[PDB]
Amino acid sequence: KVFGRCELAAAMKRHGLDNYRGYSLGNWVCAAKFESNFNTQATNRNTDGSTDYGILQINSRWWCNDGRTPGSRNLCNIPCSALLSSDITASVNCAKKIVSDGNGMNAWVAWRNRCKGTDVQAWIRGCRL
């Protein structure tokens, strides 16, 4: 599924992301936009043997198990295929874990390079909450 901006904002809000660990909703929407272009099926296969999965491009070395990645930690305790669903629940739950495991949103390269320092509120502006 390819989400709309406001639709994804609403879904993320329903799942508790607004102000999760001090990160406003627009940060999360921005991260998804630049990680996956809102596409729940996005995959990026890396040359290091890992793969980035889903709307938030969560990597298979630390976070989910795909059975093919060296050094797998599976800290979200899920198969990576769960991150490719049309429902965002698994991706949100794992994203929460990523920040709970001592990272901030700097874990997402696209957030650090394309969202940090910007008017992230723009990503939710005009939307029904």
C-alpha positions as a Python dict, from the first residue, in 0.01 Angstrom:
ca = {
    (1, 'K'): (0, 0, 0),
    (2, 'V'): (117, 354, -67),
    (3, 'F'): (-19, 580, 204),
    (4, 'G'): (-127, 936, 180),
    (5, 'R'): (43, 1180, 413),
    (6, 'C'): (-262, 1259, 621),
    (7, 'E'): (-380, 901, 628),
    (8, 'L'): (-45, 786, 757),
    (9, 'A'): (-40, 1067, 1013),
    (10, 'A'): (-375, 953, 1147),
    (11, 'A'): (-266, 589, 1163),
    (12, 'M'): (55, 681, 1342),
    (13, 'K'): (-138, 898, 1589),
    (14, 'R'): (-373, 609, 1664),
    (15, 'H'): (-67, 397, 1739),
    (16, 'G'): (75, 642, 1991),
    (17, 'L'): (364, 799, 1801),
    (18, 'D'): (284, 1162, 1862),
    (19, 'N'): (536, 1279, 2120),
    (20, 'Y'): (677, 929, 2169),
    (21, 'R'): (1006, 988, 2350),
    (22, 'G'): (974, 1356, 2264),
    (23, 'Y'): (940, 1320, 1890),
    (24, 'S'): (634, 1496, 1743),
    (25, 'L'): (412, 1323, 1489),
    (26, 'G'): (555, 1519, 1198),
    (27, 'N'): (898, 1368, 1258),
    (28, 'W'): (758, 1020, 1205),
    (29, 'V'): (566, 1113, 893),
    (30, 'C'): (873, 1287, 751),
    (31, 'A'): (1089, 983, 823),
    (32, 'A'): (848, 756, 639),
    (33, 'K'): (826, 992, 341),
    (34, 'F'): (1202, 993, 286),
    (35, 'E'): (1270, 634, 384),
    (36, 'S'): (1005, 463, 171),
    (37, 'N'): (791, 725, -4),
    (38, 'F'): (503, 591, 210),
    (39, 'N'): (523, 244, 48),
    (40, 'T'): (461, -42, 290),
    (41, 'Q'): (627, -291, 51),
    (42, 'A'): (954, -105, 8),
    (43, 'T'): (1269, -319, 36),
    (44, 'N'): (1633, -216, -4),
    (45, 'R'): (1877, -504, -38),
    (46, 'N'): (2223, -398, 81),
    (47, 'T'): (2568, -527, -20),
    (48, 'D'): (2645, -615, 343),
    (49, 'G'): (2391, -898, 339),
    (50, 'S'): (2122, -703, 526),
    (51, 'T'): (1794, -569, 392),
    (52, 'D'): (1585, -268, 494),
    (53, 'Y'): (1212, -347, 517),
    (54, 'G'): (888, -157, 496),
    (55, 'I'): (757, 192, 547),
    (56, 'L'): (1031, 281, 796),
    (57, 'Q'): (1309, 82, 627),
    (58, 'I'): (1401, -121, 936),
    (59, 'N'): (1723, -318, 894),
    (60, 'S'): (1763, -690, 929),
    (61, 'R'): (2096, -698, 1108),
    (62, 'W'): (1972, -565, 1440),
    (63, 'W'): (1596, -548, 1436),
    (64, 'C'): (1408, -826, 1253),
    (65, 'N'): (1491, -1178, 1139),
    (66, 'D'): (1501, -1261, 768),
    (67, 'G'): (1719, -1575, 804),
    (68, 'R'): (1976, -1447, 553),
    (69, 'T'): (2159, -1169, 742),
    (70, 'P'): (2488, -1227, 921),
    (71, 'G'): (2506, -1119, 1285),
    (72, 'S'): (2130, -1107, 1335),
    (73, 'R'): (2013, -982, 1675),
    (74, 'N'): (1634, -973, 1606),
    (75, 'L'): (1576, -715, 1879),
    (76, 'C'): (1215, -652, 1773),
    (77, 'N'): (1150, -1031, 1793),
    (78, 'I'): (972, -1049, 1460),
    (79, 'P'): (1019, -1190, 1113),
    (80, 'C'): (1109, -910, 871),
    (81, 'S'): (813, -1008, 652),
    (82, 'A'): (582, -871, 925),
    (83, 'L'): (723, -527, 837),
    (84, 'L'): (584, -558, 482),
    (85, 'S'): (218, -559, 579),
    (86, 'S'): (-42, -301, 473),
    (87, 'D'): (-117, -244, 841),
    (88, 'I'): (160, -47, 1009),
    (89, 'T'): (136, -197, 1355),
    (90, 'A'): (449, -416, 1343),
    (91, 'S'): (656, -134, 1196),
    (92, 'V'): (538, 109, 1464),
    (93, 'N'): (602, -141, 1744),
    (94, 'C'): (954, -203, 1620),
    (95, 'A'): (1021, 167, 1566),
    (96, 'K'): (926, 224, 1932),
    (97, 'K'): (1176, -46, 2030),
    (98, 'I'): (1450, 115, 1823),
    (99, 'V'): (1415, 438, 2021),
    (100, 'S'): (1372, 246, 2352),
    (101, 'D'): (1708, 68, 2286),
    (102, 'G'): (1892, 390, 2330),
    (103, 'N'): (1876, 539, 1986),
    (104, 'G'): (1701, 854, 1893),
    (105, 'M'): (1557, 919, 1552),
    (106, 'N'): (1913, 948, 1423),
    (107, 'A'): (1878, 574, 1366),
    (108, 'W'): (1698, 668, 1044),
    (109, 'V'): (1945, 816, 797),
    (110, 'A'): (1669, 984, 604),
    (111, 'W'): (1539, 1153, 918),
    (112, 'R'): (1883, 1286, 1005),
    (113, 'N'): (1950, 1417, 656),
    (114, 'R'): (1603, 1532, 539),
    (115, 'C'): (1389, 1596, 845),
    (116, 'K'): (1619, 1716, 1125),
    (117, 'G'): (1625, 2094, 1131),
    (118, 'T'): (1321, 2131, 904),
    (119, 'D'): (960, 2240, 963),
    (120, 'V'): (836, 1888, 1034),
    (121, 'Q'): (493, 2021, 1125),
    (122, 'A'): (442, 2079, 755),
    (123, 'W'): (396, 1703, 720),
    (124, 'I'): (79, 1704, 927),
    (125, 'R'): (-50, 2050, 838),
    (126, 'G'): (-398, 2051, 695),
    (127, 'C'): (-475, 1694, 809),
    (128, 'R'): (-777, 1561, 1009),
    (129, 'L'): (-623, 1423, 1336),
}
